[PDB]
Structures are given as structure tokens and as C-alpha cells.
Amino acid sequence: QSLRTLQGHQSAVTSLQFNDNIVVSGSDDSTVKVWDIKTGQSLRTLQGHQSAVTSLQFNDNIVVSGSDDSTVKVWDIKTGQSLRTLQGHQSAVTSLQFNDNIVVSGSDDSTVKVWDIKTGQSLRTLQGHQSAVTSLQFNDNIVVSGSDDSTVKVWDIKTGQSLRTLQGHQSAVTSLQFNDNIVVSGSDDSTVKVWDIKTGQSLRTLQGHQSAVTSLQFNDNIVVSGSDDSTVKVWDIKTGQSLRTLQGHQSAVTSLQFNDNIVVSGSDDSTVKVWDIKTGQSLRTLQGHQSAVTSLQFNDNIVVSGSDDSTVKVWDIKG
């Protein structure tokens, strides 16, 4: 069931992230909007971007967004003003992640750039990729980046060098997740690969998808991936076997998220689907979107989804 349909975005919503009392949405209208999830009304419209917003991340005080204008901006989430503009990328910024000290941005110019968040200076520039960087993730020591060059590269977050290059994918890498033990990468070649992060060798290749893999997520036991073949698949990470295939969507799966109990997926068929992961059976179909679903996020009881119809919708996860 839909509770609140947030409105005021004039173009497709690309990214979102919500807490207990606010939602932060990025869209193709070059604006970032802050809303009150309870009332469903807009508080602040963050302006300064000259093209579509591709990703975002916020904490209690700060919002960090990436846009198609090759800039990463840092916003005060309460006053609505822009604090820093980070300039160094020469093409669209596709992914971002930031902590207390630094921000890390991936771009179409095949470079990952590290910036000390309170300075705005370009600390490091990670060179090595031959095409657009699509996804990234870093911890205290290292950075793992995916790119259109069909390779996943590991870097040292402070030395600025490349540690390993994970090779085997025959098409662009779209998503990645990693721990100190392994990395998990999805690619356009319809395969998900599990690698040993320490040595950079391929531990397994998950096969079964008939088209590009768009999103993934894994815990200690399982990998959950969504593909362009309108299906979500469950895998066993150590075995490499296919566990369950979730079938209900009639178009490509774009975003997903899961826990020990359920799997919440978004697709281009304008529907968000909640499934019991143990069964592999659909529990609900969230309807109300008039166009493709681009991003989602859920907690214990509600789901927040963004769609191409320039709307952000809140859903009761099981009501």
C-alpha cells in the first residue's frame, strides 16, 4: 500500500536515501530535494547542479551528491546551502561514498578521485581504468572500483596506487560489494563473479542470468542479484550454485535490497516486488508508479522507491 507520494521533481528520480524522519532524493532535473517522510512534503530544494543528479549520500549534517556536470557537491542538510563544489572530473560522476574525513567519487573519465571532505582539495586521482567508472566502495584502507573496461580494480586509499586488477568479465562492470575476504561483482556479460580480494583471483562465476546484471547484494551466506532478464536470483556464495529465481517482473530489474526475511526489488515494469526469500515466492506487488523504478530502500516496515515518473513513493512493506 502507498502512504505518501512525494511530488515536485520535474524529471526522473535517480537516487534516494531516507532515515527516520527525512528522505533525500536526486533527480534528472539537477536538483536534490529533502522531504519529511511522515507528512510527505518538501522542505529544501538543493540547487547548484547544471545537469542530472546521479547519486547521493547524507548523514546527520551533510549531503553529498554527484551529477552529470562532472561535479560533486556538499550540502548542509538543514540550511539548504551548498558548502563545497569539488571540481576535477571532466565527465559525469556516476558513484560516490564519503565518511568523516574524505569523499570518493567515480566518474565517466575513467578516474576515481579522493577528496578530503573539509578541504575540497583533490587529494588523489586513481588512474588505471580505460573507460567509465560505474561503481565504487571503500573502507579504511582500500578502494574497490568497477568500470566499463570489464575490470574491477583495487586501490590503496592513501597511497593512490593500484593493488590488483580483477579480470574475467567480458563486459562492463555495473555493481560491486566487498568485504576483507572477498569481492562480488556483477557485469553486463550476465555473470556475477566472486573474487578473493587478497590475491585478485576468481573464486567462482555465478551463471544463469540471460542478460546484464544491474544490481547485487550479499551477506555471509547468499548473493542476491537482479538482471536485465526481469528476474532476481539467489546464490550460495561459497558453493556458487543457484538457489532460487524470483519471477514476476516483466522488465529489467534495476534496484534491490534484502534481509534475512525478504527481498525487495524494483524493475522497469513500474512495480516494486517484495518476496519471501526462503520461499522464492512473491508476497506483494507495489503498484502506483507510471514508469520504471530506478532506486529503492526499505527498513522494518516501510519502503521508499524512486521512479522515472518524477515521483518518490512510500510503501507499507507488508500492509
mmCIF file of C-alpha atoms in Angstrom:
data_model
loop_
_atom_site.group_PDB
_atom_site.id
_atom_site.type_symbol
_atom_site.label_atom_id
_atom_site.label_comp_id
_atom_site.label_asym_id
_atom_site.label_seq_id
_atom_site.Cartn_x
_atom_site.Cartn_y
_atom_site.Cartn_z
ATOM 1 C CA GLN A 1 0.000 0.000 0.000
ATOM 2 C CA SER A 2 1.146 3.537 -0.827
ATOM 3 C CA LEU A 3 1.163 6.088 2.007
ATOM 4 C CA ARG A 4 2.730 9.271 0.599
ATOM 5 C CA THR A 5 3.528 10.234 -3.000
ATOM 6 C CA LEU A 6 6.189 12.933 -2.869
ATOM 7 C CA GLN A 7 5.935 15.464 -5.700
ATOM 8 C CA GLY A 8 7.797 18.457 -7.077
ATOM 9 C CA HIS A 9 10.501 16.689 -9.096
ATOM 10 C CA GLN A 10 10.137 17.627 -12.760
ATOM 11 C CA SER A 11 12.220 14.721 -14.104
ATOM 12 C CA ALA A 12 13.101 11.102 -13.384
ATOM 13 C CA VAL A 13 14.328 10.278 -9.882
ATOM 14 C CA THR A 14 17.727 8.566 -9.973
ATOM 15 C CA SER A 15 18.769 8.025 -6.342
ATOM 16 C CA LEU A 16 17.387 8.231 -2.820
ATOM 17 C CA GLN A 17 18.225 7.633 0.834
ATOM 18 C CA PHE A 18 15.959 8.008 3.862
ATOM 19 C CA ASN A 19 16.211 7.998 7.648
ATOM 20 C CA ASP A 20 13.634 8.042 10.453
ATOM 21 C CA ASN A 21 12.116 11.419 9.551
ATOM 22 C CA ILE A 22 13.548 12.633 6.203
ATOM 23 C CA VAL A 23 14.047 11.457 2.625
ATOM 24 C CA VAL A 24 16.747 12.802 0.289
ATOM 25 C CA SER A 25 16.133 12.377 -3.443
ATOM 26 C CA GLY A 26 18.193 13.124 -6.536
ATOM 27 C CA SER A 27 16.604 13.521 -9.954
ATOM 28 C CA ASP A 28 17.267 14.346 -13.601
ATOM 29 C CA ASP A 29 16.169 17.965 -13.010
ATOM 30 C CA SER A 30 19.598 18.827 -11.500
ATOM 31 C CA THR A 31 18.066 19.290 -8.027
ATOM 32 C CA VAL A 32 18.317 17.484 -4.692
ATOM 33 C CA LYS A 33 15.196 17.588 -2.521
ATOM 34 C CA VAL A 34 14.758 16.963 1.206
ATOM 35 C CA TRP A 35 11.336 15.841 2.414
ATOM 36 C CA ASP A 36 9.546 14.862 5.606
ATOM 37 C CA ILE A 37 8.670 11.184 5.166
ATOM 38 C CA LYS A 38 5.840 11.494 7.702
ATOM 39 C CA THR A 39 3.999 14.428 6.122
ATOM 40 C CA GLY A 40 5.327 13.796 2.619
ATOM 41 C CA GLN A 41 6.027 17.481 1.943
ATOM 42 C CA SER A 42 9.181 19.106 0.602
ATOM 43 C CA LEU A 43 11.432 21.079 2.934
ATOM 44 C CA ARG A 44 14.530 22.091 0.959
ATOM 45 C CA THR A 45 15.336 22.024 -2.760
ATOM 46 C CA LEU A 46 19.115 21.975 -3.187
ATOM 47 C CA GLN A 47 20.175 23.943 -6.270
ATOM 48 C CA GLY A 48 23.533 24.446 -7.949
ATOM 49 C CA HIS A 49 23.817 21.485 -10.296
ATOM 50 C CA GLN A 50 23.651 22.208 -14.024
ATOM 51 C CA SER A 51 22.626 18.668 -15.036
ATOM 52 C CA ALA A 52 21.061 15.460 -13.740
ATOM 53 C CA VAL A 53 21.957 14.158 -10.280
ATOM 54 C CA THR A 54 23.235 10.579 -10.426
ATOM 55 C CA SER A 55 23.937 9.620 -6.796
ATOM 56 C CA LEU A 56 23.742 10.929 -3.247
ATOM 57 C CA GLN A 57 24.729 10.153 0.337
ATOM 58 C CA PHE A 58 23.862 12.031 3.520
ATOM 59 C CA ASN A 59 24.452 11.896 7.258
ATOM 60 C CA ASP A 60 23.010 13.949 10.121
ATOM 61 C CA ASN A 61 24.642 17.204 8.965
ATOM 62 C CA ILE A 62 25.751 16.735 5.357
ATOM 63 C CA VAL A 63 24.512 15.723 1.908
ATOM 64 C CA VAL A 64 26.973 14.709 -0.824
ATOM 65 C CA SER A 65 25.691 14.412 -4.394
ATOM 66 C CA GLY A 66 27.146 13.536 -7.782
ATOM 67 C CA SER A 67 25.844 14.951 -11.046
ATOM 68 C CA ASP A 68 26.241 14.745 -14.814
ATOM 69 C CA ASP A 69 28.120 18.080 -14.765
ATOM 70 C CA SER A 70 31.334 16.395 -13.508
ATOM 71 C CA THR A 71 30.963 17.955 -10.043
ATOM 72 C CA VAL A 72 30.425 16.529 -6.568
ATOM 73 C CA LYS A 73 28.680 18.977 -4.237
ATOM 74 C CA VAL A 74 28.489 19.026 -0.436
ATOM 75 C CA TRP A 75 25.326 20.437 1.135
ATOM 76 C CA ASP A 76 24.200 21.487 4.596
ATOM 77 C CA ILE A 77 21.123 19.296 5.018
ATOM 78 C CA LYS A 78 19.399 21.791 7.343
ATOM 79 C CA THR A 79 20.193 25.238 5.909
ATOM 80 C CA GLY A 80 19.911 24.075 2.283
ATOM 81 C CA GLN A 81 23.017 25.983 1.185
ATOM 82 C CA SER A 82 25.882 24.459 -0.784
ATOM 83 C CA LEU A 83 29.199 24.375 1.090
ATOM 84 C CA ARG A 84 31.803 22.918 -1.298
ATOM 85 C CA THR A 85 31.969 22.206 -5.005
ATOM 86 C CA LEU A 86 34.575 19.572 -5.843
ATOM 87 C CA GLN A 87 36.000 20.061 -9.340
ATOM 88 C CA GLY A 88 38.427 17.720 -11.069
ATOM 89 C CA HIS A 89 36.357 15.247 -13.041
ATOM 90 C CA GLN A 90 35.982 16.075 -16.734
ATOM 91 C CA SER A 91 32.835 13.960 -17.204
ATOM 92 C CA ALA A 92 29.744 12.784 -15.335
ATOM 93 C CA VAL A 93 30.179 11.409 -11.816
ATOM 94 C CA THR A 94 28.484 8.014 -11.550
ATOM 95 C CA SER A 95 29.040 6.919 -7.930
ATOM 96 C CA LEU A 96 30.166 8.344 -4.604
ATOM 97 C CA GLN A 97 30.834 7.449 -0.976
ATOM 98 C CA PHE A 98 32.078 9.566 1.917
ATOM 99 C CA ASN A 99 32.937 9.327 5.603
ATOM 100 C CA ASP A 100 34.085 11.651 8.387
ATOM 101 C CA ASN A 101 37.313 12.628 6.604
ATOM 102 C CA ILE A 102 37.130 12.090 2.827
ATOM 103 C CA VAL A 103 34.813 11.555 -0.133
ATOM 104 C CA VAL A 104 35.461 9.133 -3.010
ATOM 105 C CA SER A 105 33.862 9.719 -6.416
ATOM 106 C CA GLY A 106 33.835 7.676 -9.607
ATOM 107 C CA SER A 107 33.428 9.322 -12.988
ATOM 108 C CA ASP A 108 32.972 8.689 -16.690
ATOM 109 C CA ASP A 109 36.524 9.973 -17.314
ATOM 110 C CA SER A 110 37.845 6.589 -16.060
ATOM 111 C CA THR A 111 39.205 8.172 -12.857
ATOM 112 C CA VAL A 112 38.348 7.720 -9.184
ATOM 113 C CA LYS A 113 39.079 10.870 -7.186
ATOM 114 C CA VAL A 114 39.655 11.151 -3.433
ATOM 115 C CA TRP A 115 38.847 14.442 -1.703
ATOM 116 C CA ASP A 116 39.336 15.455 1.919
ATOM 117 C CA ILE A 117 35.766 16.471 2.675
ATOM 118 C CA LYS A 118 36.524 19.523 4.825
ATOM 119 C CA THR A 119 39.081 20.995 2.384
ATOM 120 C CA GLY A 120 37.530 20.352 -1.024
ATOM 121 C CA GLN A 121 41.009 19.674 -2.422
ATOM 122 C CA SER A 122 41.675 16.735 -4.754
ATOM 123 C CA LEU A 123 43.913 14.564 -2.586
ATOM 124 C CA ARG A 124 44.395 11.656 -5.001
ATOM 125 C CA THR A 125 43.383 10.735 -8.543
ATOM 126 C CA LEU A 126 43.169 6.984 -9.156
ATOM 127 C CA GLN A 127 44.362 6.372 -12.722
ATOM 128 C CA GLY A 128 44.226 2.972 -14.371
ATOM 129 C CA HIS A 129 40.774 2.398 -15.818
ATOM 130 C CA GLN A 130 40.263 2.555 -19.580
ATOM 131 C CA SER A 131 36.570 3.524 -19.511
ATOM 132 C CA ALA A 132 33.813 4.999 -17.362
ATOM 133 C CA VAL A 133 33.794 4.040 -13.684
ATOM 134 C CA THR A 134 30.348 2.726 -12.754
ATOM 135 C CA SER A 135 30.541 1.750 -9.069
ATOM 136 C CA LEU A 136 32.832 2.042 -6.066
ATOM 137 C CA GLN A 137 33.166 1.152 -2.391
ATOM 138 C CA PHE A 138 35.924 1.899 0.132
ATOM 139 C CA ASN A 139 36.815 1.149 3.731
ATOM 140 C CA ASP A 140 39.642 2.374 5.962
ATOM 141 C CA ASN A 141 42.488 1.114 3.754
ATOM 142 C CA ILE A 142 41.381 0.305 0.202
ATOM 143 C CA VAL A 143 39.041 1.242 -2.650
ATOM 144 C CA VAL A 144 37.277 -1.205 -4.982
ATOM 145 C CA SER A 145 36.100 0.279 -8.280
ATOM 146 C CA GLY A 146 34.190 -1.145 -11.219
ATOM 147 C CA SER A 147 34.357 0.270 -14.731
ATOM 148 C CA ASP A 148 33.149 -0.081 -18.303
ATOM 149 C CA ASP A 149 36.504 -1.705 -19.185
ATOM 150 C CA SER A 150 35.191 -5.044 -17.810
ATOM 151 C CA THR A 151 37.663 -4.894 -14.899
ATOM 152 C CA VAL A 152 37.356 -4.394 -11.142
ATOM 153 C CA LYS A 153 40.348 -2.604 -9.624
ATOM 154 C CA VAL A 154 41.521 -2.429 -6.006
ATOM 155 C CA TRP A 155 43.462 0.610 -4.800
ATOM 156 C CA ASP A 156 45.094 1.806 -1.605
ATOM 157 C CA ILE A 157 43.032 4.728 -0.333
ATOM 158 C CA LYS A 158 46.101 6.729 0.763
ATOM 159 C CA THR A 159 48.994 5.597 -1.451
ATOM 160 C CA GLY A 160 46.899 6.150 -4.577
ATOM 161 C CA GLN A 161 48.321 3.081 -6.321
ATOM 162 C CA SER A 162 46.529 0.094 -7.844
ATOM 163 C CA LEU A 163 46.868 -3.153 -5.883
ATOM 164 C CA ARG A 164 45.174 -5.684 -8.175
ATOM 165 C CA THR A 165 43.004 -5.799 -11.272
ATOM 166 C CA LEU A 166 40.268 -8.415 -11.287
ATOM 167 C CA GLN A 167 39.858 -9.835 -14.791
ATOM 168 C CA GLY A 168 37.478 -12.337 -16.338
ATOM 169 C CA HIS A 169 34.414 -10.228 -17.019
ATOM 170 C CA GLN A 170 33.869 -9.752 -20.753
ATOM 171 C CA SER A 171 31.612 -6.690 -20.421
ATOM 172 C CA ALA A 172 31.167 -3.562 -18.320
ATOM 173 C CA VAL A 173 31.050 -3.962 -14.540
ATOM 174 C CA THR A 174 27.885 -2.367 -13.154
ATOM 175 C CA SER A 175 27.832 -3.149 -9.420
ATOM 176 C CA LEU A 176 30.160 -4.399 -6.695
ATOM 177 C CA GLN A 177 30.168 -5.209 -2.991
ATOM 178 C CA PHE A 178 33.158 -6.320 -0.964
ATOM 179 C CA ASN A 179 34.494 -7.427 2.405
ATOM 180 C CA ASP A 180 38.027 -8.024 3.665
ATOM 181 C CA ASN A 181 37.695 -11.639 2.479
ATOM 182 C CA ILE A 182 36.023 -11.424 -0.951
ATOM 183 C CA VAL A 183 34.643 -9.073 -3.574
ATOM 184 C CA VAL A 184 31.462 -9.663 -5.575
ATOM 185 C CA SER A 185 30.985 -8.042 -8.980
ATOM 186 C CA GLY A 186 28.139 -8.035 -11.478
ATOM 187 C CA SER A 187 28.728 -7.308 -15.150
ATOM 188 C CA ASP A 188 26.869 -6.837 -18.419
ATOM 189 C CA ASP A 189 28.025 -10.319 -19.532
ATOM 190 C CA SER A 190 25.170 -11.883 -17.488
ATOM 191 C CA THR A 191 27.540 -13.262 -14.826
ATOM 192 C CA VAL A 192 28.317 -12.489 -11.185
ATOM 193 C CA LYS A 193 31.887 -13.234 -10.096
ATOM 194 C CA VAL A 194 33.219 -13.801 -6.570
ATOM 195 C CA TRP A 195 36.908 -12.983 -6.154
ATOM 196 C CA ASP A 196 39.497 -13.303 -3.420
ATOM 197 C CA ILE A 197 40.286 -9.662 -2.623
ATOM 198 C CA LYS A 198 43.718 -10.560 -1.241
ATOM 199 C CA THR A 199 45.068 -12.193 -4.375
ATOM 200 C CA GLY A 200 42.685 -10.954 -7.074
ATOM 201 C CA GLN A 201 41.858 -14.427 -8.385
ATOM 202 C CA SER A 202 38.410 -15.616 -9.442
ATOM 203 C CA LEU A 203 36.901 -17.873 -6.784
ATOM 204 C CA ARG A 204 33.685 -18.591 -8.727
ATOM 205 C CA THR A 205 31.425 -17.406 -11.546
ATOM 206 C CA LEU A 206 27.659 -17.342 -10.956
ATOM 207 C CA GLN A 207 25.912 -18.244 -14.219
ATOM 208 C CA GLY A 208 22.215 -18.414 -15.020
ATOM 209 C CA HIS A 209 21.230 -14.869 -15.914
ATOM 210 C CA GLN A 210 20.405 -14.358 -19.590
ATOM 211 C CA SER A 211 21.349 -10.659 -19.766
ATOM 212 C CA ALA A 212 23.202 -7.874 -17.961
ATOM 213 C CA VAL A 213 23.327 -7.848 -14.159
ATOM 214 C CA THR A 214 22.242 -4.461 -12.814
ATOM 215 C CA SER A 215 22.359 -4.781 -9.015
ATOM 216 C CA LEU A 216 23.596 -7.143 -6.327
ATOM 217 C CA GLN A 217 23.911 -7.611 -2.568
ATOM 218 C CA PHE A 218 25.429 -10.362 -0.439
ATOM 219 C CA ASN A 219 25.722 -11.475 3.169
ATOM 220 C CA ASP A 220 27.855 -14.239 4.669
ATOM 221 C CA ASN A 221 25.612 -16.938 3.205
ATOM 222 C CA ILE A 222 23.979 -15.690 -0.018
ATOM 223 C CA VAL A 223 24.215 -13.338 -3.005
ATOM 224 C CA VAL A 224 21.079 -11.614 -4.327
ATOM 225 C CA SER A 225 21.313 -10.154 -7.843
ATOM 226 C CA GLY A 226 18.907 -8.511 -10.280
ATOM 227 C CA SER A 227 19.375 -8.685 -14.032
ATOM 228 C CA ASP A 228 18.069 -7.282 -17.305
ATOM 229 C CA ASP A 229 16.112 -10.539 -17.782
ATOM 230 C CA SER A 230 13.397 -9.343 -15.342
ATOM 231 C CA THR A 231 14.416 -11.939 -12.727
ATOM 232 C CA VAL A 232 16.047 -11.857 -9.300
ATOM 233 C CA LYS A 233 18.292 -14.793 -8.404
ATOM 234 C CA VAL A 234 19.567 -16.166 -5.091
ATOM 235 C CA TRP A 235 23.016 -17.768 -4.929
ATOM 236 C CA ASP A 236 25.159 -19.553 -2.364
ATOM 237 C CA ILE A 237 28.391 -17.565 -2.193
ATOM 238 C CA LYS A 238 30.786 -20.403 -1.267
ATOM 239 C CA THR A 239 29.117 -23.008 -3.454
ATOM 240 C CA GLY A 240 28.384 -20.815 -6.456
ATOM 241 C CA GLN A 241 25.107 -22.660 -7.012
ATOM 242 C CA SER A 242 21.797 -21.087 -7.959
ATOM 243 C CA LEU A 243 19.354 -21.293 -5.059
ATOM 244 C CA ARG A 244 16.122 -19.626 -6.188
ATOM 245 C CA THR A 245 14.974 -17.485 -9.094
ATOM 246 C CA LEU A 246 12.317 -14.866 -8.368
ATOM 247 C CA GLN A 247 9.950 -14.476 -11.337
ATOM 248 C CA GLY A 248 7.225 -11.844 -11.517
ATOM 249 C CA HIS A 249 8.717 -8.747 -13.101
ATOM 250 C CA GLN A 250 8.052 -8.198 -16.802
ATOM 251 C CA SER A 251 11.032 -5.864 -17.321
ATOM 252 C CA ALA A 252 14.640 -5.373 -16.264
ATOM 253 C CA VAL A 253 15.419 -5.251 -12.540
ATOM 254 C CA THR A 254 17.186 -2.009 -11.600
ATOM 255 C CA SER A 255 17.387 -1.911 -7.789
ATOM 256 C CA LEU A 256 17.076 -4.431 -4.975
ATOM 257 C CA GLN A 257 17.615 -4.873 -1.245
ATOM 258 C CA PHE A 258 17.151 -7.808 1.103
ATOM 259 C CA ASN A 259 17.488 -9.005 4.683
ATOM 260 C CA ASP A 260 17.271 -12.401 6.375
ATOM 261 C CA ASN A 261 13.498 -12.444 5.762
ATOM 262 C CA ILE A 262 12.514 -10.780 2.467
ATOM 263 C CA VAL A 263 13.763 -9.369 -0.836
ATOM 264 C CA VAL A 264 12.515 -6.006 -2.134
ATOM 265 C CA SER A 265 13.189 -5.407 -5.830
ATOM 266 C CA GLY A 266 12.465 -2.643 -8.314
ATOM 267 C CA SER A 267 12.040 -3.048 -12.052
ATOM 268 C CA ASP A 268 11.317 -1.212 -15.291
ATOM 269 C CA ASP A 269 7.717 -2.502 -15.230
ATOM 270 C CA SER A 270 6.909 0.344 -12.781
ATOM 271 C CA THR A 271 6.437 -2.145 -9.915
ATOM 272 C CA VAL A 272 8.236 -2.862 -6.649
ATOM 273 C CA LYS A 273 8.093 -6.508 -5.602
ATOM 274 C CA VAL A 274 8.514 -7.937 -2.101
ATOM 275 C CA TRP A 275 9.308 -11.646 -1.901
ATOM 276 C CA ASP A 276 9.825 -14.124 0.885
ATOM 277 C CA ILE A 277 13.438 -15.088 0.202
ATOM 278 C CA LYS A 278 13.228 -18.581 1.704
ATOM 279 C CA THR A 279 10.226 -19.448 -0.461
ATOM 280 C CA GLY A 280 11.215 -17.529 -3.558
ATOM 281 C CA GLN A 281 7.538 -16.531 -3.786
ATOM 282 C CA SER A 282 6.190 -13.006 -4.198
ATOM 283 C CA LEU A 283 4.439 -11.611 -1.127
ATOM 284 C CA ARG A 284 3.249 -8.272 -2.553
ATOM 285 C CA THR A 285 3.378 -6.119 -5.679
ATOM 286 C CA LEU A 286 3.680 -2.381 -5.028
ATOM 287 C CA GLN A 287 1.712 -0.540 -7.720
ATOM 288 C CA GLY A 288 1.276 3.173 -8.323
ATOM 289 C CA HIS A 289 4.298 4.100 -10.419
ATOM 290 C CA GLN A 290 3.688 5.091 -14.038
ATOM 291 C CA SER A 291 7.256 4.416 -15.216
ATOM 292 C CA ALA A 292 10.417 2.454 -14.459
ATOM 293 C CA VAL A 293 11.662 2.154 -10.877
ATOM 294 C CA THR A 294 15.262 3.324 -10.507
ATOM 295 C CA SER A 295 16.133 3.070 -6.798
ATOM 296 C CA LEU A 296 14.665 1.786 -3.544
ATOM 297 C CA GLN A 297 15.390 1.406 0.172
ATOM 298 C CA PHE A 298 13.417 -0.224 2.976
ATOM 299 C CA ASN A 299 13.530 -0.679 6.733
ATOM 300 C CA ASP A 300 11.481 -2.874 9.067
ATOM 301 C CA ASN A 301 8.084 -1.584 7.920
ATOM 302 C CA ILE A 302 8.291 0.902 5.007
ATOM 303 C CA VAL A 303 9.817 1.112 1.530
ATOM 304 C CA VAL A 304 10.872 4.297 -0.280
ATOM 305 C CA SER A 305 11.116 3.993 -4.063
ATOM 306 C CA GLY A 306 12.102 6.374 -6.840
ATOM 307 C CA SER A 307 10.766 6.098 -10.372
ATOM 308 C CA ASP A 308 11.132 7.606 -13.828
ATOM 309 C CA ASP A 309 7.759 9.355 -13.363
ATOM 310 C CA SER A 310 9.469 12.077 -11.272
ATOM 311 C CA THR A 311 7.864 10.801 -8.052
ATOM 312 C CA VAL A 312 9.083 9.254 -4.801
ATOM 313 C CA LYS A 313 6.640 6.877 -3.117
ATOM 314 C CA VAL A 314 6.486 5.424 0.396
ATOM 315 C CA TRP A 315 5.097 1.907 0.845
ATOM 316 C CA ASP A 316 3.979 -0.154 3.829
ATOM 317 C CA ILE A 317 6.345 -3.108 3.486
ATOM 318 C CA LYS A 318 3.754 -5.720 4.421
ATOM 319 C CA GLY A 319 0.474 -3.806 4.574
#
